[PDB]
Design a binder for this molecule. Structure first.
Ligand SMILES: O=c1ccn([C@H]2C[C@H](O)[C@@H](COP(=O)(O)O)O2)c(=O)[nH]1
Ligand SMILES: O=c1ccn([C@H]2C[C@H](O)[C@@H](COP(=O)(O)O)O2)c(=O)[nH]1
Lengths: 290, 290
């Protein structure tokens, strides 16, 4: 029967199996095939410092970590993240990518009013990735933190990246579109709504990212981490990735690693990559992709 | 048994039951006790005209229908609904309610930049509930319809009411915060993200509302209805509703009613209450409590 060291990662694999077994076979934005279920939900225990970094296929932790800190900082400048040696946004801000979208006047690495800007300045008039936006638009992350501290019973602790007014100027429309927080018996929980998820790369990354976010905010608020709830619109596997995911489905998950913060923080803006430690991230062997 | 005429309503009852059994006890913003689960999801088939109006406890159909048409019209004037003998917004737009929020210059019924305003003019400058907003802000509903018709493969078909810039001026923050649409083999599906849901009174109403909207857009787009995915943040039952819900839980659901449109429509703005028929809405008798 179903006895597993890491039940939450096992359920993830079950999620992937269900997509491949019941999913619809459609052609997507690029003309490639996906196998897809619309509407899925899964839950991940964050208690005792557990962060859900998948063990059956390695997730780029360094990238997760630096992108999150960068999001939080409000930055929309791809070059700042490249300075931290993370290159996941590089191809979305280069001359060719920008020009193809009509952003011929824009400087390289200026990603437009993407996540960081929305999280910290929702409603402000975007100029460029070098403008000082202090006190412009709504600082959602700050409000979420005040709400958690002052009104922990609230059912309105929401942060959203989905800004229709700004979509035309973003290099990519937001994928993790919004999240909601929830305080129960001194524990902080988070639900991510992600409109679109690739189960082979994107989803594991987003999973770790919001897991880390919940850990950070919990610390800032003097709370213990709770449950991450991950909700998907179009959950899919690319049809060229099926063999690779099948190899992943065959593995018995290891225990998730643990997150550890090595100093105190004054606020959500007071973390640095050197004081966020990840203990015992053990992964199964590499899975080659195509 | 394990077999039901209406498996979808049966699953909703099981949802209520899961909350009562596994939910956490909380005292909310109102003061009354809730029993709560954070993060739930359920699916409702809409194929062949089916609309999930609950049968074990009657849903206020006239309210659902008139509110939706009013939403689509972009109106934020509560008096238009009161003109049709729908009083669900009355408490929220009267003198004392407005004054308590500091909207002391507002006429009665001026709900602020609520749903309808966000749907048709996201990012526009709110003045009052009589202002003509043509060409101001993003018409999200029209874009959704454009995307469904022209890019049915899109994983980006989103409409959101969650506007941080406008929250302070709304009489209530949006409860059904955003929805995503999905086209598969000519079948239109919709996922609602609801941040907060009263299983007893709110949720059934929200289900019927988004069910109806999905049927409407499907007709506009020459498509067929698919599935409604209902996602909840704080899924709760009010502690004083417990006994009446226990009664409801032993009822065997009847078949859902079906929706039928009795003439063609030029666009999403061309529906009227008289041409939306609801066939065979058969319910169990009223509950001995409220
Ligand atoms: O944070 C992200 C960003 C992207 N993707 C995946 C989902 C889609 O396969 C693709 C984005 O394409 P659209 O959904 O925008 O078409 O990348 C994720 O899983 N997570
Ligand atoms: O469309 C709605 C609006 C409200 N509610 C319920 C949920 C909560 O019980 C209450 C709103 O309170 P807050 O979640 O806003 O505190 O009404 C719904 O179920 N659906």
């Amino acid at each position: 029967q179903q006895v597993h060291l890491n039940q939450d990662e096992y359920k993830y694999l079950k999620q992937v199996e269900q997509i491949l077994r019941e999913g619809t076979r459609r052609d997507d934005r690029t003309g490639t095939g996906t196998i897809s279920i619309f509407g899925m939900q899964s839950k991940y225990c964050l208690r005792n410092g557990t962060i859900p970094l998948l063990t059956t296929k390695r997730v780029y932790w360094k990238g997760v970590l630096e992108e999150l800190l960068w999001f939080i900082s409000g930055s929309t400048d791809g070059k700042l993240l490249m300075e931290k040696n993370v290159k996941i946004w590089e191809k979305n801000g280069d001359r060719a990518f920008l020009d193809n979208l009509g952003f011929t006047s824009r400087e390289e690495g200026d990603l437009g009013p993407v996540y960081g800007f929305q999280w910290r300045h929702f409603g402000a008039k975007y100029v460029d990735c070098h403008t000082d936006y202090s006190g412009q638009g709504v600082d959602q992350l700050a409000e979420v933190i005040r709400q958690i501290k002052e009104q922990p019973d609230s059912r309105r602790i929401i942060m959203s990246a989905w800004n229709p007014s700004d979509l035309g100027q973003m290099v990519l429309p937001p994928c993790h579109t919004m999240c909601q927080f929830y305080v129960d018996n001194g524990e902080l929980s988070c639900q991510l709504y992600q409109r679109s998820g690739d189960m082979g790369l994107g989803v594991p990354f987003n999973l770790a990212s919001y897991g880390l976010l919940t850990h950070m905010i919990a610390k800032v608020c003097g709370l213990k981490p709770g449950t991450l709830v991950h909700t998907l619109g179009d959950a899919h596997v690319y049809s060229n990735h099926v063999d690779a995911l099948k190899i992943q489905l065959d593995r018995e998950p290891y225990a998730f690693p643990k997150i550890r913060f090595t100093r105190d923080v004054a606020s959500i803006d007071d973390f640095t990559s050197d004081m966020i430690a990840l203990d015992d991230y053990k992964c199964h062997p590499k899975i080659p992709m195509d």
